[PDB]
Design a protein around this ligand. Structure first.
Ligand SMILES: Nc1ncnc2c1ncn2[C@@H]1O[C@H](COP(=O)(O)OP(=O)(O)OP(=O)(O)O)[C@@H](O)[C@H]1O
Ligand SMILES: Nc1ncnc2c1ncn2[C@@H]1O[C@H](COP(=O)(O)OP(=O)(O)O)[C@@H](O)[C@H]1O
Ligand SMILES: Nc1ncnc2c1ncn2[C@@H]1O[C@H](COP(=O)(O)OP(=O)(O)O)[C@@H](O)[C@H]1O
Ligand SMILES: Nc1ncnc2c1ncn2[C@@H]1O[C@H](COP(=O)(O)OP(=O)(O)O)[C@@H](O)[C@H]1O
Ligand SMILES: CP(=O)(O)CC[C@H](N)C(=O)O
Lengths: 473, 475, 475, 160
């Protein structure tokens, strides 16, 4: 009843016309329901907002439809894009049937995960750093018929348009190749002005930014946002994606975060940077390995342990496993190395006492960031308590190594498809179930979501290529 | 190739004014290739010790540096080609290995010969008969795209649901279409292929196959011809014969044909239902009194197929598109059980069963497989059942498509594999029954798995699927 | 099937040079289905105990785990197919149940056989003669769209009044059209089908039917060919024979036909007028002096049909589109009464009545019905009337279309059901006259019921109608 | 409340719209829902079955007249069916003897002409008016719907 006080005056000052609550279902889809501002009261930011939770896969049945969304009054912001002054408020789903936060609400599973660390005493805060690579495209067509599957992404930069005629029969040239976006100047990079637009809008929504470049792939970009609390970071993951997409829309374009839209060029990742702190210290800083600690070396060993099951949350779509192909800055072998992008985890080279972190490179933004980040922690905490060796560091370009020497040398490796990684995750979920952080009911709801939403379609829908190879059998 | 077998061939050619001789052979994928000779150039020594060719052009076979191999002509089942504009005689060929000096251990017609011979040597029988129903589609068009920014296919047949509102010749649209899953088997004009189908049969007749049924099939532009059973190699030859004709009579009618298992999502798939019986001294050994007119021999055979099925499947369902077909509810099996009159099952025991018709039909193989291999492997697995009296279990006579995933997993029924990699895995974890008597060579199975992982699995896993842009582009 | 008719069938197929034997049979909808055998394959032993087939592909019949069934050939009214390019013979078949070991209780042709027999065994009569007037439309084009955001249909025909102002081949339009309701029966050029109707009649002559009238009918593109009556089963057979011929002669002339009941709003429908008489010992039992040349037997038979009509119409008007047709002002009956020379009644006593020609014309059925089931049902409805001496009321010699809304409900005439759901509920409420002598099994009345509810009513109750957007889109 | 044929294409199971005539709390599968938000002030019913093809003056009038009538005759509501009421099979519905919304406008117009007395209370709905409504809907919605062929029956029936 003070952040309420602070809130209800912050609205009077920006002339807030609508209160836009935003929540995240299990897929990570940020949803919004919005109220007329004069109808909002003190006694509804403690009562909560009713919604229908039966319209969300993995959540409520239709005979127990009504749930409460509960306002949480931090990191709210003024929508840059609405034409009538809206303010955006983060919410949790509260379960009016077990009278507790919703066991299938990710922003709660993340919250539950953030304090599990506190109550474990292993550390106080756990910081998350999310490089979210993206694409900005010109057009996006799809078809899913009985007789035809079909997609086509479009961008003027693309090698498919070197022979093409644009406005006057004209084609201004000046293109990055396949794998050529890193990092030419204009006019080759067409997207200088629009990315300084995003950042300026990201500054205005509360994220602290620091880098903006063009990425390797054809229409690819990246913004460095400053690391945050486990939850706070994923709040900012959702915020980022809203801004980028809506900046793309209003600039007459379409943007995506998906893992791998272009075959044969780089795919957007989610480079997660993690380090755990306590009593003003960075508990990964040490002297045991290249500026790292045994607590660190172990946190790592928990994530390299449950990685195959961890991909179920970290790499949550079939399209992710089109990214995990050797040869595109993306990872595959579950190992670690300093200064090395062909690894699953790179120690950043800029490593002083405060910066000491791991960069897990394997996630992409088809993960739900709350669940994704939640699960990178329980994995790590299981590393500390069970003091589990991370193995030996491999300072090799891992891609080049012949495929028979992976089985031969016995080194673990990312799963090749999603169905696989849902199966490792079900085969050992126990570290996820600590202190009912991830409940089993939710763990179940999750997979009867991802199989029905993702695995079973892929498995049953003819693939264009299957007609090159098999239609002449 | 006898010496009078040779002269009857020359005479046949002479009688028929053969201008060309067209040798044909199958590579591991199952593709049927040819190389043809001026008849005047053909001599009595070429049909005795071989035709030179370049075997490094076929994923699986030779490296560029030991590239030369030899085709050995087998003068059986040759025929005058119905479609060539100059009289030619198609002649079936084996590959000969001119380094190890022996029939090529990777030549799929050789493997089936070794298989059928393995059966004779062991004395379990003299002959394995195979019946193969090869369903096919006939389309009007097939568009494909495979670039970096796009993936795309489209079939077209005027019988198709998607054409109900379409305009054709004069803005005119004729009506009378079968529904999705409604082509079975209405009369014309809903059935727009009665003619091209009787064309097919008559030409199948010319090329040496005996026919009985022809009919329309469930899916929109789908068909089936019933051709009599041959021995293990003869049937696998007649499958290639069938596929050639159906693809050529479709082409000369300005149309295009596919034996791939699942060109349409939401409609019935195209199978190779294989019907099997093993015989010794002129008694069908499958005939008996144990279970619905079948014997303990027959049942054990069945035990081996089911036992080794998930490995077998890497040969009998030889493509990623094969698994799009193995999906509940299109008369395609998913559960590895057997039953009478039950199309929900893997193995169907048919109704009109007699001392002549004692058989099984195995409904899980498709035509994306190599017939020579998918058959040999069905035998190897099957004799492994006889030799070890492997037990099929008891028939499930339910609708298995109704069974829940929990209910299916709980009672712990074995199902088909869900992908081509898994069944390839399962097949490398279980090679022994194939390797009996050098029938399937260890070398060959390695080439086979390397070929298939590189030509089918890694494309699939690494090539974005369109429907992924529905589910994940807006994340 | 005696081995005599088997001798004469084979011998018939040698002199017409037959390459295929096209076996045919009708499902519960009435869709005529075929499956063809290479003639050289055909066997005496096969025409004795039958052809197997996949029975699970037919709504209402078997389920996939008892899918096998036997088609049993019936060597009557076979005929050379005019239309196929390679000589085929079309042969009718029944469905045999190989689980209950009996003619299939859900094969319409058997049920109709059970009806004709039941009349025999009942002693009421030796034979029941059925004459069927099968009106049709010949269109040029038919487009349909069945989507989430759209429902669409367009018929086209050059006769249609929607083309008076349109350009055809070279900016040109020949005029001379019948208007709405004008097709009866102006000479050419207005009548654009003198030659395609004569083609039909002739190809009906070839395939075995006696024809007499051929005319254009009242609606824009309509027509009717009179056929000499047959026995209950034979009349049903020739309804399938006719429908085939008419749909194929449309096809090969660049056109598309339909027996559907009401393809055009505001113009006449397509009816199937059923002419019916029952004889015994060579005398026409309908012949008498009780009313307009008919006997008591006749009237009471009629008493039966009208009593049970509301339920009967689920069997004789079998599609939601049947009920678009059953509305006043287009020569179809909505009012369940009888009258001599009145085309606005349900049943008409045609004028030229002799002792040989005493019959009733039941006018309410349409061709969307299953002819075997529709005729069986009428017979039962009428047998019930003979046995129970049901009185058909008196005659209604008026223009029944001129009867105002709350006036036909005043005088307590009952009228046809307004929707196919309502006809279905009536029939399940009055089954007992169908199951007499087990002619219509109960098991069968339930399959039919779920057949029609699922395949007609629920799609109608659930799919937005375009006209609903006129009335409610601005609500 | 559902004064159009279009109404009855919505009253179909599976689309968050009620077919079965019973009530339940937190249940979008029922005719009447009891909101969890149920204070001393906000105690209401959500009758989920109306739609905006009703004249809403007529609709709220007739809801009241029936809902009033309930009080005078102390009409018992039955037991709460707190089920996903879609999951009921057709036969389980008949055997359980469950009331259910009409499948057609024609039907509900008939069911209403057979049950009028509770609207004619204290002259609120006139016999005269009811009679004029009765014909207006019949001539303007039922008779069109029953006579204008439907696209779907050409898939179904053009090839009969
Ligand atoms: N005591 C009351 N009497 C009548 N109407 C009321 C009463 N209290 C609230 N209402 C009205 O009923 C409606 C309820 O809106 P509300 O937002 O509560 O919907 P809901 O059924 O909970 O659906 P959802 O879960 O989709 O938000 C509003 O129009 C509201 O003002
Ligand atoms: N101690 C830390 N804990 C967590 N994240 C950090 C820490 N230090 C930096 N980061 C974050 O790492 C992400 C990547 O920063 P960047 O300078 O791009 O590193 P790199 O050299 O790995 O590319 C940013 O979100 C950044 O704020
Ligand atoms: N004893 C037998 N062994 C192996 N195959 C057989 C035997 N008898 C028949 N067949 C074959 O079985 C296949 C199909 O049987 P079929 O009669 O077509 O079944 P259905 O028509 O019900 O699908 C054909 O290739 C046929 O020759
Ligand atoms: N005794 C009878 N029983 C049954 N049908 C008959 C009998 N006599 C004639 N029919 C048939 O009834 C139909 C009558 O045709 P028609 O006399 O042209 O009638 P309309 O002028 O109403 O078209 C024909 O199929 C004809 O064979
Ligand atoms: C009518 P049928 O017995 O031939 C079933 C064939 C099926 N499409 C399949 O996938 O094998």
């Amino acid at each position: 009843e003070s952040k309420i006080k602070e809130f209800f005056e912050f609205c009077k000052e920006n002339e807030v016309e609508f209160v836009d609550f935003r929540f995240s279902d299990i897929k990570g889809t940020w949803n919004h329901i919005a109220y007329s501002f004069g109808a909002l009261t003190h006694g509804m930011l403690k009562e909560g907002i009713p919604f229908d939770a039966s319209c969300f896969k993995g959540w409520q049945g239709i005979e127990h439809s009504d749930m409460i969304l509960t306002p949480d009054l931090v990191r709210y912001f003024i929508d840059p894009f609405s034409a009538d002054v809206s303010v955006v408020v983060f919410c949790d789903v509260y379960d009016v049937y077990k009278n507790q936060p919703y066991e299938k609400c990710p922003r709660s599973i993340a919250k539950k995960a953030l304090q599990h660390l506190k109550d474990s005493g292993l550390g106080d805060v756990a910081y998350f750093g999310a490089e979210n690579e993206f694409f900005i495209f010109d057009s996006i067509k799809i078809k899913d018929a009985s007789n035809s599957q079909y997609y086509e992404v479009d961008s003027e930069e693309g090698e498919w348009n070197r022979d093409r005629s644009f406005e006057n029969g004209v084609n201004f040239g000046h293109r990055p190749g396949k794998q050529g976006g890193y990092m030419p100047v204009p006019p080759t990079d067409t997207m200088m002005d629009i990315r300084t637009e995003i950042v300026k809008v990201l500054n205005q929504v509360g994220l602290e930014t620091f880098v903006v470049h063009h990425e390797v792939a054809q229409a690819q970009g990246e913004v460095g946002v400053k690391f945050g609390d486990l939850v706070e970071a994923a709040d900012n993951v959702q915020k980022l994606k809203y801004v980028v997409k809506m900046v793309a829309h209003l600039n007459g374009k379409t943007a995506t975060f998906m893992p791998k839209p272009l075959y044969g060029d780089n795919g957007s990742g989610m480079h997660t940077h993690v380090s755990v702190w306590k009593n003003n210290e960075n508990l990964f800083s040490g002297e045991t390995y290249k500026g790292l600690s045994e607590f660190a070396l172990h946190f790592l060993g928990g994530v390299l342990r449950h990685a195959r099951g961890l991909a179920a949350f970290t790499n949550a779509s079939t399209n992710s496993y089109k990214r995990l192909i050797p040869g595109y800055e993306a990872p595959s072998i579950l190992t670690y190395s300093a200064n090395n992008r062909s690894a699953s985890v790179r120690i950043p080279y800029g490593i002083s006492k405060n910066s000491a972190r791991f960069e897990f490179r394997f996630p992409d933004s088809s993960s739900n960031p709350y669940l994704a980040f939640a699960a990178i922690l329980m994995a790590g905490m299981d590393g500390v308590k069970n003091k589990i060796d991370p193995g030996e560091a491999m300072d090799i370009n891992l891609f080049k190594l012949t495929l028979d020497e992976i089985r031969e040398k016995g080194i673990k490796q990312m799963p090749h498809t999603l169905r696989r990684s849902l199966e490792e995750m079900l085969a050992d979920k126990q570290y996820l179930k600590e202190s009912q952080v991830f409940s089993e009911e939710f763990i179940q709801a999750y997979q009867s979501l991802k199989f029905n939403a993702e695995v079973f379609p892929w498995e049953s829908k003819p693939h264009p290529f299957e007609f090159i190879t098999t239609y002449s059998c």
